Design a binder for this molecule. Structure first.
Ligand SMILES: Nc1ncnc2c1ncn2[C@@H]1O[C@H](COP(=O)(O)O)[C@@H](O)[C@H]1O
Ligand SMILES: Nc1ncnc2c1ncn2[C@@H]1O[C@H](COP(=O)(O)O)[C@@H](O)[C@H]1O
Lengths: 246, 253
């Protein structure tokens, strides 16, 4: 015969990058299902930790060990911050609030405020959900952002390039630095910047600083060689990359 | 005065000795204590209270055989209509909304995982939940929901897990019977007269709405309330995600 679209996409979903796997569709599907169920049975028997959660924790350990303060800010923020971010893809909620499309606005308020109680340099970071009406191969609507930044005198690209390297070296991911765009192949892993920037004026930040934002789903995409980033995202359709529609 | 009192309670900490000293002098002493606390934290801690508790709770459950779940926060509006709600919902756009609870997604995982895992199916999620709201309620809170599905799951197992859980977190509690129409004979996990969690033993009518036929037990705890008890916070806003507090310390210094 020849697989119909519906059957190819179906095999696609049940397929795993590590799969060793002609044969008719029903046999291919039956065998792949059997494997996926076993893969799930293994995770349940040995691991049990969710990829998204586990990586978040590992990333948190790294930064917390390197002197960064772990921030947990609101996901539902005032629409003002979006304006204040010089934004003239957003999920609006109610009257003047929305779902944070980035971690920057809330981190800015922490840099400013903390800058009055903590000695330079101020090192903070946050890992969490961000939303953007979106190319499900690199982009999701609900993704997880890692944002870190250090504020104080002397902060430079060098400093920045240092953390990014120790970081990705730690995670165990290849990369290529090329504002900076931490690339892995041609997949953008992160967007980093060396302060100060005009926008700093909009939030009361008057010291130089360095920061980078990474998408944990892309880190996972690369770490587990997923074709579709959705396999790394929050969903009820995949668990640690294993289809749940079995 | 009134306004002075308010900004004083904001800088006042639970562990402080807290009468007649002039305001300026009182505010000053608190501002320095707060920066000191915030400085000790930045030097020896650095872990968000919410994040740390989540990580501790996660280890507790993964170690007892529960699978860790991370599901969408932005869920389909129908899941709400499906839970039996026709409320304080943050609708976003056409037909989506910020989950007001974890039940729907966990219901789906139970249904799907039952086709691949041997009973008992044990899962749990920890994450953001939303409800439009004061001294005990946040609009944006953090929920922990765990449940086991499979025959055998009795009220006994439920009370036993909660007990090991709260014993591990070192949180004194009382479990009182509660009864309502939709959920039936429920379990209230109390600390004084503050509710820590609602615990239910399935099956219940609502189940058929999600493709679940088997019995189960589950309970949901709000982390902020767990924090509020552990740290003896007066206002639950001390533990919530916010730009005004950090581990219960005012950031306006
Ligand atoms: N829509 C998205 N879906 C998934 N990840 C994203 C998305 N947008 C951004 N990211 C991740 O966050 C990084 C920085 O995004 P940004 O600086 O806002 O352009 C990107 O390089 C990705 O690592
Ligand atoms: N608005 C809220 N703010 C903080 N915690 C909450 C809130 N709603 C529920 N919780 C916590 O979650 C538990 C169960 O909530 P429910 O979904 O109504 O059964 C409550 O007893 C609290 O422990």
């Amino acid at each position: 015969p020849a697989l119909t679209k519906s059957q190819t996409d179906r095999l696609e979903v049940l397929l795993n990058p590590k799969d060793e796997i002609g044969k008719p569709f029903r046999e291919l599907e039956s065998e792949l299902l059997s494997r996926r169920k076993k893969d799930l049975q293994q995770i349940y028997a040995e691991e049990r930790e969710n990829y998204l959660g586990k990586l978040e924790r590992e990333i948190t350990r790294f930064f917390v060990d390197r002197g960064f303060l772990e921030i947990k800010s609101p996901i539902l923020i005032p629409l003002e911050y979006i304006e204040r971010m010089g934004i003239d893809q957003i999920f609006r909620v109610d009257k003047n609030f929305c779902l944070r499309p980035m971690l920057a606005p809330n981190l800015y308020n922490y840099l400013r405020k903390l800058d009055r109680a903590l000695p330079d340099p101020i090192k903070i970071f946050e890992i969490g959900p961000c939303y953007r009406k979106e190319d499900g191969k690199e982009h999701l609507e609900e993704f997880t952002m890692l944002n870190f930044c250090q504020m104080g005198s002397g902060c430079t690209r060098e400093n920045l390039e240092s953390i990014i390297t120790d970081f990705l070296n730690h995670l165990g991911i290849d990369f290529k630095i090329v504002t900076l765009d931490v690339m892995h192949g041609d997949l953008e892993l992160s967007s980093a910047v060396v302060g100060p920037i005009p926008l700093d004026r909009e939030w009361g930040i008057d010291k130089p600083w360095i920061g980078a934002g990474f998408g944990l789903e892309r880190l996972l995409k690369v770490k587990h060689d997923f074709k579709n980033i959705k396999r790394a995202a929050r969903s009820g359709s995949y668990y640690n990359g294993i289809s749940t529609n079995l």
